[PDB]
CSV table of C-alpha atoms in Angstrom, one decimal:
chain,number,residue,atom,x,y,z
I,6,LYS,CA,-0.8,150.4,-28.0
I,7,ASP,CA,2.5,152.3,-27.3
I,8,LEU,CA,3.9,152.8,-30.8
I,9,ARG,CA,7.2,154.4,-31.5
I,10,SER,CA,7.4,157.7,-33.3
I,11,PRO,CA,8.6,156.9,-36.8
I,12,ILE,CA,11.7,158.5,-38.2
I,13,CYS,CA,12.3,160.1,-41.6
I,14,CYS,CA,14.9,162.1,-43.5
I,15,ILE,CA,15.1,164.6,-46.4
I,16,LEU,CA,17.4,164.2,-49.3
I,17,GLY,CA,17.5,167.7,-50.8
I,18,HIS,CA,19.7,170.1,-52.8
I,25,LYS,CA,14.4,174.9,-48.0
I,26,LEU,CA,11.6,172.4,-47.9
I,27,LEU,CA,12.1,171.5,-44.2
I,28,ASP,CA,12.1,175.2,-43.4
I,29,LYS,CA,8.5,175.2,-44.6
I,30,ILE,CA,7.5,172.0,-42.9
I,31,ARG,CA,8.9,173.2,-39.6
I,32,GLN,CA,6.9,176.5,-39.7
I,33,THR,CA,4.1,177.0,-37.2
I,34,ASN,CA,1.5,179.8,-36.8
I,35,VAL,CA,0.1,181.1,-33.5
I,41,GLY,CA,2.3,173.7,-31.8
I,42,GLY,CA,5.2,172.1,-30.0
I,43,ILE,CA,7.6,171.5,-33.0
I,44,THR,CA,11.1,171.4,-31.5
I,45,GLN,CA,14.6,171.7,-32.8
I,46,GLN,CA,16.7,168.9,-31.5
I,47,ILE,CA,20.2,167.8,-32.1
I,48,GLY,CA,20.5,167.0,-35.8
I,49,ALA,CA,16.8,166.5,-36.0
I,50,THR,CA,13.4,168.2,-35.7
I,51,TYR,CA,10.5,166.6,-33.8
I,52,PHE,CA,6.8,167.0,-34.7
I,53,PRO,CA,4.3,166.1,-31.9
I,54,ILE,CA,1.2,164.4,-33.2
I,55,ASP,CA,-1.1,167.4,-32.4
I,56,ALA,CA,1.0,169.6,-34.6
I,57,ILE,CA,0.7,167.1,-37.4
I,58,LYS,CA,-3.1,167.0,-36.9
I,59,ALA,CA,-3.2,170.7,-37.2
I,60,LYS,CA,-1.1,170.7,-40.3
I,61,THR,CA,-3.0,167.8,-42.0
I,62,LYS,CA,-6.5,169.2,-41.2
I,63,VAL,CA,-7.1,170.0,-44.8
I,64,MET,CA,-6.4,166.4,-45.8
I,65,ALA,CA,-9.8,165.3,-44.3
I,66,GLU,CA,-11.2,166.4,-47.7
I,67,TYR,CA,-9.5,163.6,-49.4
I,68,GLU,CA,-8.6,161.0,-46.9
I,69,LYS,CA,-9.2,159.0,-43.8
I,70,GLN,CA,-6.9,160.1,-41.0
I,71,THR,CA,-4.9,158.0,-38.4
I,72,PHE,CA,-3.1,159.4,-35.4
I,73,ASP,CA,-1.7,156.5,-33.4
I,74,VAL,CA,2.0,157.6,-32.9
I,75,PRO,CA,3.4,160.2,-30.5
I,76,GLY,CA,4.8,162.2,-33.3
I,77,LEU,CA,7.4,162.2,-36.1
I,78,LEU,CA,11.1,162.7,-36.0
I,79,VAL,CA,12.8,164.3,-39.0
I,80,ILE,CA,16.5,164.0,-39.4
I,81,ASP,CA,17.5,167.4,-40.7
I,82,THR,CA,21.3,167.3,-41.3
I,83,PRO,CA,22.5,168.0,-44.8
I,84,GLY,CA,24.2,164.7,-45.7
I,85,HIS,CA,23.6,161.0,-45.8
I,86,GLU,CA,23.8,160.7,-42.0
I,87,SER,CA,20.6,158.6,-42.1
I,88,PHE,CA,22.6,155.9,-43.7
I,89,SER,CA,25.5,155.9,-41.3
I,90,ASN,CA,24.8,152.5,-39.9
I,91,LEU,CA,24.9,149.2,-41.6
I,92,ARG,CA,22.0,148.8,-44.1
I,93,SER,CA,20.8,145.8,-41.9
I,94,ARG,CA,20.0,148.2,-39.1
I,95,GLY,CA,18.8,150.9,-41.4
I,96,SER,CA,15.2,151.1,-40.2
I,97,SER,CA,16.5,151.6,-36.7
I,98,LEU,CA,17.9,154.9,-37.8
I,99,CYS,CA,15.4,156.0,-40.5
I,100,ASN,CA,12.0,154.4,-41.4
I,101,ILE,CA,11.5,156.3,-44.7
I,102,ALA,CA,13.3,158.9,-46.9
I,103,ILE,CA,12.0,161.9,-48.7
I,104,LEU,CA,13.7,162.4,-52.0
I,105,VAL,CA,13.2,166.0,-53.1
I,106,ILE,CA,13.1,166.7,-56.8
I,107,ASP,CA,12.9,170.1,-58.5
I,108,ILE,CA,9.9,170.2,-60.8
I,109,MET,CA,11.4,173.1,-62.8
I,110,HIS,CA,14.9,172.0,-63.6
I,111,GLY,CA,14.5,168.3,-63.0
I,112,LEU,CA,17.1,165.9,-61.6
I,113,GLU,CA,20.4,167.2,-60.3
I,114,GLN,CA,23.3,164.8,-60.1
I,115,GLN,CA,23.1,164.8,-56.3
I,116,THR,CA,19.5,163.5,-56.9
I,117,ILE,CA,20.8,160.7,-59.1
I,118,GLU,CA,23.4,159.6,-56.5
I,119,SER,CA,20.7,159.7,-53.9
I,120,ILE,CA,18.6,157.4,-56.1
I,121,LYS,CA,21.4,154.9,-56.4
I,122,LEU,CA,22.2,155.1,-52.7
I,123,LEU,CA,18.6,154.4,-51.8
I,124,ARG,CA,18.5,151.4,-54.1
I,125,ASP,CA,21.7,150.0,-52.6
I,126,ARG,CA,20.6,150.6,-49.0
I,127,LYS,CA,17.2,149.1,-50.0
I,128,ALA,CA,15.6,152.0,-48.1
I,129,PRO,CA,12.0,153.0,-48.6
I,130,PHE,CA,11.2,156.5,-49.8
I,131,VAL,CA,8.8,158.9,-51.4
I,132,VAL,CA,9.4,161.8,-53.7
I,133,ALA,CA,8.6,165.4,-52.9
I,134,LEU,CA,8.2,167.0,-56.2
I,135,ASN,CA,9.0,170.6,-55.1
I,136,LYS,CA,8.7,174.1,-56.6
I,137,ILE,CA,5.2,173.9,-58.1
I,138,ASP,CA,4.8,177.6,-57.3
I,139,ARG,CA,7.3,178.3,-60.1
I,140,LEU,CA,4.7,177.1,-62.5
I,141,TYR,CA,3.6,180.3,-64.4
I,142,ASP,CA,0.5,182.0,-63.0
I,143,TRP,CA,0.4,179.5,-60.2
I,144,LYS,CA,-2.3,180.9,-57.9
I,145,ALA,CA,-1.3,179.8,-54.4
I,146,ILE,CA,-3.4,179.0,-51.4
I,147,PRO,CA,-1.1,178.9,-48.4
I,148,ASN,CA,-0.6,175.5,-46.7
I,149,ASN,CA,-3.4,174.0,-48.7
I,150,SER,CA,-3.6,170.3,-49.8
I,151,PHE,CA,-2.3,169.7,-53.3
I,152,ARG,CA,-5.5,168.4,-54.9
I,153,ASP,CA,-7.5,171.3,-53.7
I,154,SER,CA,-5.1,174.0,-55.0
I,155,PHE,CA,-4.6,172.1,-58.2
I,156,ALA,CA,-8.3,171.9,-59.0
I,157,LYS,CA,-8.5,175.6,-58.5
I,158,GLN,CA,-5.7,176.4,-61.0
I,159,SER,CA,-6.3,177.5,-64.6
I,160,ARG,CA,-6.5,174.8,-67.3
I,161,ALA,CA,-3.3,176.3,-68.4
I,162,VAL,CA,-1.5,175.9,-65.1
I,163,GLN,CA,-2.8,172.3,-64.9
I,164,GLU,CA,-1.2,171.7,-68.3
I,165,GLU,CA,2.2,173.1,-67.3
I,166,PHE,CA,2.1,170.9,-64.3
I,167,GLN,CA,1.4,167.8,-66.5
I,168,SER,CA,4.2,168.6,-68.9
I,169,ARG,CA,6.9,169.2,-66.3
I,170,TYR,CA,5.6,166.2,-64.3
I,171,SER,CA,5.9,163.9,-67.3
I,172,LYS,CA,9.4,165.2,-68.0
I,173,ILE,CA,10.4,164.3,-64.4
I,174,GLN,CA,8.7,160.9,-64.7
I,175,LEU,CA,10.9,160.3,-67.7
I,176,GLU,CA,14.0,161.4,-65.9
I,177,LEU,CA,13.0,159.0,-63.1
I,178,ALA,CA,12.5,156.1,-65.6
I,179,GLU,CA,16.0,156.9,-66.8
I,180,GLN,CA,17.3,156.2,-63.3
I,181,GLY,CA,15.3,153.0,-63.4
I,182,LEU,CA,12.3,154.3,-61.4
I,183,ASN,CA,8.7,154.1,-62.2
I,184,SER,CA,6.7,156.7,-60.5
I,185,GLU,CA,3.2,157.8,-59.7
I,186,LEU,CA,1.3,160.5,-57.8
I,187,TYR,CA,0.7,159.2,-54.3
I,188,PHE,CA,-3.1,159.0,-54.4
I,189,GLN,CA,-2.8,157.0,-57.7
I,190,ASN,CA,-0.3,154.4,-56.4
I,191,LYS,CA,-1.9,151.0,-56.2
I,192,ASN,CA,1.4,149.2,-56.6
I,193,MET,CA,3.9,150.8,-54.1
I,194,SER,CA,6.1,147.8,-54.6
I,195,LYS,CA,6.5,148.9,-58.3
I,196,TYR,CA,5.9,152.7,-58.0
I,197,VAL,CA,7.4,155.2,-55.7
I,198,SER,CA,4.8,157.7,-54.6
I,199,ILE,CA,5.1,161.3,-55.7
I,200,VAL,CA,3.9,164.2,-53.6
I,201,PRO,CA,3.9,167.7,-55.3
I,202,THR,CA,5.0,170.3,-52.8
I,203,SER,CA,6.0,174.0,-52.4
I,204,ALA,CA,8.6,174.9,-49.8
I,205,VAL,CA,7.5,178.5,-50.6
I,206,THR,CA,3.7,178.3,-50.1
I,207,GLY,CA,3.4,175.1,-48.0
I,208,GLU,CA,1.0,173.5,-50.5
I,209,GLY,CA,1.4,169.8,-50.6
I,210,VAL,CA,3.0,169.7,-47.2
I,211,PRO,CA,-0.2,168.4,-45.6
I,212,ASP,CA,-0.3,165.7,-48.2
I,213,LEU,CA,3.3,164.8,-47.4
I,214,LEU,CA,2.7,164.5,-43.7
I,215,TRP,CA,-0.4,162.5,-44.2
I,216,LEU,CA,1.5,160.1,-46.6
I,217,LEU,CA,4.5,159.6,-44.2
I,218,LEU,CA,2.1,158.9,-41.3
I,219,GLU,CA,0.1,156.6,-43.6
I,220,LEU,CA,3.1,154.5,-44.8
I,221,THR,CA,4.7,154.2,-41.4
I,222,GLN,CA,1.6,153.4,-39.4
I,223,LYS,CA,0.1,151.0,-41.9
I,224,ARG,CA,2.9,149.2,-43.7
I,225,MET,CA,5.6,149.5,-41.0
I,226,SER,CA,3.6,148.7,-37.8
I,227,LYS,CA,6.1,146.1,-36.6
I,228,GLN,CA,8.9,148.7,-36.9
I,229,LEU,CA,6.8,150.9,-34.6
I,230,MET,CA,6.1,148.2,-32.1
I,231,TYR,CA,7.2,148.9,-28.5
I,232,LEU,CA,10.7,147.6,-27.7
I,233,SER,CA,12.2,146.7,-24.4
I,234,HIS,CA,15.7,147.7,-25.2
I,235,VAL,CA,17.4,151.0,-26.2
I,236,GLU,CA,18.1,151.8,-29.9
I,237,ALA,CA,20.5,154.6,-30.4
I,238,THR,CA,22.8,155.3,-33.3
I,239,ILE,CA,25.8,157.6,-33.5
I,240,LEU,CA,25.6,160.2,-36.3
I,241,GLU,CA,28.3,162.7,-35.4
I,242,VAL,CA,31.5,162.8,-33.3
I,243,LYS,CA,32.1,166.4,-32.5
I,244,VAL,CA,34.3,168.4,-30.1
I,245,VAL,CA,32.3,171.0,-28.1
I,246,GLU,CA,34.4,173.4,-25.9
I,247,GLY,CA,33.5,172.6,-22.3
I,248,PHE,CA,32.6,169.0,-23.1
I,249,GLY,CA,35.5,167.8,-25.1
I,250,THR,CA,34.5,165.1,-27.7
I,251,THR,CA,30.7,164.7,-27.7
I,252,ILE,CA,28.5,162.4,-29.8
I,253,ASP,CA,25.3,163.3,-31.7
I,254,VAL,CA,22.9,160.4,-31.6
I,255,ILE,CA,19.4,159.5,-32.8
I,256,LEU,CA,17.5,157.8,-29.9
I,257,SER,CA,14.9,155.8,-31.8
I,258,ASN,CA,13.9,153.5,-28.9
I,259,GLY,CA,14.0,153.5,-25.1
I,260,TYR,CA,15.5,155.7,-22.5
I,261,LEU,CA,18.8,157.3,-21.8
I,262,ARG,CA,19.7,158.5,-18.3
I,263,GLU,CA,22.5,160.7,-16.9
I,264,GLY,CA,24.9,158.3,-15.3
I,265,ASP,CA,24.1,155.4,-17.5
I,266,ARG,CA,27.0,153.0,-18.2
I,267,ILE,CA,27.2,152.7,-22.0
I,268,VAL,CA,29.3,150.8,-24.4
I,269,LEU,CA,30.2,151.9,-27.9
I,270,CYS,CA,32.1,150.8,-31.0
I,271,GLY,CA,35.4,152.5,-31.3
I,272,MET,CA,38.2,152.5,-34.0
I,273,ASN,CA,40.6,150.7,-31.7
I,274,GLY,CA,38.1,148.5,-30.0
I,275,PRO,CA,35.0,148.8,-27.7
I,276,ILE,CA,34.6,151.9,-25.5
I,277,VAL,CA,32.9,151.9,-22.2
I,278,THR,CA,32.0,155.0,-20.3
I,279,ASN,CA,29.3,156.8,-18.3
I,280,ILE,CA,26.9,159.5,-19.6
I,281,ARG,CA,27.9,162.9,-18.1
I,282,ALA,CA,25.3,164.9,-19.9
I,283,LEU,CA,22.3,164.7,-22.2
I,284,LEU,CA,22.0,167.8,-24.3
I,285,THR,CA,19.4,169.4,-26.6
I,286,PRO,CA,19.3,172.9,-28.1
I,287,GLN,CA,18.3,175.9,-26.1
I,288,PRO,CA,15.4,177.6,-27.9
I,289,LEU,CA,15.5,180.9,-26.0
I,290,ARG,CA,17.9,183.5,-27.2
I,291,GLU,CA,18.5,185.0,-23.7
I,292,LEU,CA,19.3,181.6,-22.2
I,293,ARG,CA,21.7,180.8,-25.1
I,294,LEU,CA,23.8,183.5,-23.5
I,295,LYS,CA,24.2,181.2,-20.6
I,296,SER,CA,24.4,177.9,-22.5
I,297,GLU,CA,23.7,176.7,-26.0
I,298,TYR,CA,22.1,173.6,-24.5
I,299,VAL,CA,19.4,172.2,-22.2
I,300,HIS,CA,20.6,169.4,-19.9
I,301,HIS,CA,18.3,166.5,-19.2
I,302,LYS,CA,18.5,163.9,-16.4
I,303,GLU,CA,16.7,161.5,-18.7
I,304,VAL,CA,15.5,161.4,-22.3
I,305,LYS,CA,13.3,159.1,-24.3
I,306,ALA,CA,12.8,158.2,-28.0
I,307,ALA,CA,12.3,159.6,-30.4
I,308,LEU,CA,14.8,162.4,-30.2
I,309,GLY,CA,18.2,163.6,-31.5
I,310,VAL,CA,20.4,164.2,-28.5
I,311,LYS,CA,24.0,165.1,-27.7
I,312,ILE,CA,25.9,163.0,-25.3
I,313,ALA,CA,28.8,164.2,-23.3
I,314,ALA,CA,31.0,161.5,-21.7
I,315,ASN,CA,34.6,160.7,-21.2
I,316,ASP,CA,36.6,158.6,-23.7
I,317,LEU,CA,34.4,159.3,-26.8
I,318,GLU,CA,37.3,160.4,-29.0
I,319,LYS,CA,37.6,157.2,-31.0
I,320,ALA,CA,33.8,156.6,-31.4
I,321,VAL,CA,32.7,155.2,-34.7
I,322,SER,CA,29.9,157.0,-36.6
I,323,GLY,CA,27.0,154.8,-37.5
I,324,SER,CA,27.7,152.5,-34.6
I,325,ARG,CA,25.1,151.7,-31.9
I,326,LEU,CA,24.8,152.2,-28.1
I,327,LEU,CA,24.3,149.6,-25.5
I,328,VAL,CA,23.4,150.5,-22.0
I,329,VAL,CA,24.9,148.2,-19.3
I,330,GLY,CA,22.2,147.0,-16.8
I,331,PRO,CA,23.1,145.9,-13.3
I,332,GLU,CA,22.4,142.3,-14.5
I,333,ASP,CA,24.3,142.6,-17.8
I,334,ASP,CA,27.9,141.5,-18.4
I,335,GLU,CA,30.0,144.5,-19.5
I,336,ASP,CA,32.7,142.4,-21.3
I,337,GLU,CA,30.1,140.5,-23.3
I,338,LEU,CA,28.3,143.7,-24.3
I,339,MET,CA,31.6,145.3,-25.3
I,340,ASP,CA,32.2,142.3,-27.6
I,341,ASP,CA,28.6,142.6,-28.9
I,342,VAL,CA,28.9,146.3,-29.8
I,343,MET,CA,31.8,145.6,-32.2
I,344,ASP,CA,30.0,142.9,-34.1
I,345,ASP,CA,29.3,145.1,-37.1
I,346,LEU,CA,32.8,146.5,-37.6
I,347,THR,CA,34.3,143.2,-36.9
I,348,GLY,CA,32.1,141.6,-39.6
I,349,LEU,CA,33.4,144.2,-42.0
I,350,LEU,CA,37.0,143.3,-40.9
I,351,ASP,CA,36.4,139.6,-41.7
I,352,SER,CA,35.4,140.5,-45.2
I,353,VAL,CA,39.1,141.4,-45.9
I,354,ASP,CA,42.3,139.5,-46.2
I,355,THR,CA,45.0,141.5,-44.3
I,356,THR,CA,47.6,139.0,-45.8
I,357,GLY,CA,46.9,139.5,-49.5
I,358,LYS,CA,47.9,142.2,-52.0
I,359,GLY,CA,45.5,145.1,-51.9
I,360,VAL,CA,44.5,148.7,-51.4
I,361,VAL,CA,44.0,150.4,-48.0
I,362,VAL,CA,40.4,151.7,-47.4
I,363,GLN,CA,39.1,154.4,-45.1
I,364,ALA,CA,35.5,155.7,-44.8
I,365,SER,CA,33.5,158.2,-42.7
I,366,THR,CA,30.9,155.7,-41.3
I,367,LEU,CA,30.0,152.1,-41.0
I,368,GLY,CA,27.4,152.5,-43.7
I,369,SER,CA,29.8,154.3,-46.0
I,370,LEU,CA,32.6,151.8,-45.4
I,371,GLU,CA,30.1,149.0,-46.1
I,372,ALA,CA,28.9,150.6,-49.3
I,373,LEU,CA,32.5,151.1,-50.5
I,374,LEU,CA,33.6,147.6,-49.6
I,375,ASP,CA,30.6,146.1,-51.4
I,376,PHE,CA,31.6,148.2,-54.5
I,377,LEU,CA,35.3,147.1,-54.4
I,378,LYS,CA,34.3,143.5,-54.1
I,379,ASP,CA,31.9,143.9,-57.0
I,380,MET,CA,34.9,145.0,-59.1
I,381,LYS,CA,37.2,142.2,-57.8
I,382,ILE,CA,39.5,144.9,-56.3
I,383,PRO,CA,41.4,143.4,-53.4
I,384,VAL,CA,41.7,145.3,-50.1
I,385,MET,CA,44.6,144.8,-47.6
I,386,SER,CA,43.4,147.1,-44.7
I,387,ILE,CA,40.3,148.8,-43.4
I,388,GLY,CA,39.7,152.0,-41.5
I,389,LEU,CA,37.3,154.8,-40.4
I,390,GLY,CA,37.4,158.6,-39.9
I,391,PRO,CA,40.1,161.2,-40.6
I,392,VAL,CA,43.3,160.0,-42.3
I,393,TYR,CA,46.6,160.2,-40.4
I,394,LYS,CA,50.2,159.5,-41.3
I,395,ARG,CA,50.0,156.2,-39.4
I,396,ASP,CA,47.1,155.2,-41.6
I,397,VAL,CA,48.9,156.0,-44.8
I,398,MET,CA,51.9,154.0,-43.5
I,399,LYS,CA,49.7,150.9,-43.8
I,400,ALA,CA,49.9,151.1,-47.6
I,401,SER,CA,53.7,151.4,-47.6
I,402,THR,CA,54.2,147.7,-47.1
I,403,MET,CA,52.3,147.4,-50.5
I,404,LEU,CA,54.9,149.4,-52.5
I,405,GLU,CA,57.5,146.7,-52.9
I,406,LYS,CA,55.0,143.8,-53.3
I,407,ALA,CA,52.8,145.8,-55.7
I,408,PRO,CA,53.3,149.4,-56.9
I,409,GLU,CA,49.7,149.4,-58.1
I,410,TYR,CA,48.0,148.6,-54.7
I,411,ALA,CA,50.1,151.1,-52.6
I,412,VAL,CA,47.1,153.4,-52.6
I,413,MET,CA,44.4,154.6,-50.2
I,414,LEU,CA,40.8,154.7,-51.2
I,415,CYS,CA,39.1,157.3,-49.0
I,416,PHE,CA,35.4,158.2,-48.8
I,417,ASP,CA,34.2,161.5,-47.3
I,418,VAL,CA,37.0,161.8,-44.8
I,419,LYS,CA,39.8,164.3,-44.1
I,420,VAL,CA,43.4,163.7,-44.8
I,421,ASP,CA,46.0,165.2,-42.4
I,422,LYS,CA,48.6,167.5,-44.1
I,423,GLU,CA,51.3,165.4,-42.6
I,424,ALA,CA,49.7,162.3,-44.1
I,425,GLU,CA,49.6,164.0,-47.6
I,426,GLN,CA,53.2,165.0,-47.4
I,427,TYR,CA,54.2,161.5,-46.3
I,428,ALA,CA,52.2,160.0,-49.1
I,429,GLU,CA,53.7,162.2,-51.7
I,430,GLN,CA,57.3,161.6,-50.5
I,431,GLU,CA,56.5,157.8,-50.4
I,432,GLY,CA,54.8,157.6,-53.7
I,433,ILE,CA,51.6,156.4,-52.1
I,434,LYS,CA,48.5,157.6,-54.0
I,435,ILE,CA,45.6,159.0,-52.0
I,436,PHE,CA,42.2,159.0,-53.7
I,437,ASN,CA,39.4,160.8,-51.7
I,438,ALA,CA,35.9,161.6,-52.9
I,439,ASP,CA,32.3,161.7,-51.6
I,440,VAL,CA,31.0,159.6,-54.4
I,441,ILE,CA,32.3,156.1,-55.0
I,442,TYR,CA,32.6,156.1,-58.8
I,443,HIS,CA,35.0,159.1,-58.6
I,444,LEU,CA,37.2,156.8,-56.6
I,445,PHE,CA,36.9,154.0,-59.1
I,446,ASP,CA,37.7,156.2,-62.1
I,447,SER,CA,40.8,157.6,-60.3
I,448,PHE,CA,42.0,154.1,-59.4
I,449,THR,CA,41.5,152.8,-63.0
I,450,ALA,CA,43.3,155.8,-64.4
I,451,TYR,CA,46.2,155.2,-62.0
I,452,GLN,CA,46.5,151.5,-62.9
I,453,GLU,CA,46.4,152.4,-66.6
I,454,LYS,CA,49.0,155.1,-66.2
I,455,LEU,CA,51.2,152.5,-64.5
I,456,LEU,CA,50.7,150.4,-67.7
I,457,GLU,CA,51.7,153.2,-70.2
């Protein structure tokens, strides 16, 4: 069979610094991701033969490495196209951070599958480490004492997980993955448990997600970043999870003001050699194939929507129809709102973030007049102005993980339009409630 390389991401507070380490093969830094060829994974999971059967039927594994929630930029309905499984990192020493708690809620709302990497086991007192060893092997070789510290901290964390509504189990004791998330103890410092983690990701993707890895005729590529690069203008960073992209390809994209159609001018990956980075930070490719994180340079990318997908226009294909098709997600979001009624104006970083926020605002019966994506401008604030006479209360903008232009802020202040901006939804809610209540007293 020709199976796709599965794609995963890490939700962490560096663990991936340890996984990406190789000792004198073929692990490559890509754009916004790191790719692990299957042979490298074999080498790194060699010690797992002691405990498990091994399966190597995929070309490799792609790890989305950016620091945010970029793996959830698209609609949840296309989630698996962007990321097959998440790794929720939890500190064994000081337990759950708040960021961890949010990540748990986000994962539940996205309905995304994940495992837990229970990191920092080295910090257990008198931990005697065996570099890059499997967990069970190093653990059996610890003192009874060390084994007991592990059990204590582990149980504390299981409690803290149960408090976020999660039941949890060590991965080799999970017989009910539908009920229990698997826990893999790791050390970013020593590398211990990393073989276990690789084996487990391989296992879950190849065994319980075989259909997701099945060969696909058509391209699957999702926009994660829209970034200016001097010499290229506005570029886009994408995850190509299926198919091929070629220099010169006619592509259509979802944009803030409608569909964009353009032609690929360059396909770019990072330049690994220091000396060559003096000449260019990138390697140009005539053609690339999944699974990879790649930067695309093309004209007219300025209004591109993060989380949107790419369609390649074939000689046979109708461009106008495809242009309509690409919009479907954003348009579906637009249909969820009544532009006529009284309501707030909403603006979000990505299709996924916009969807998560809209779902929330509907859950709270909070009406929304207008919808938007990306950085906030004065023209965007102006949308809420109409609200002021009809309702003082709804003349507000609810913004998620976006930037507000100074001009927009001054305009809002001078107009008495409230701008609430946060990177966690409940912050927005609390601010809005507070505002309404203030208006009441």
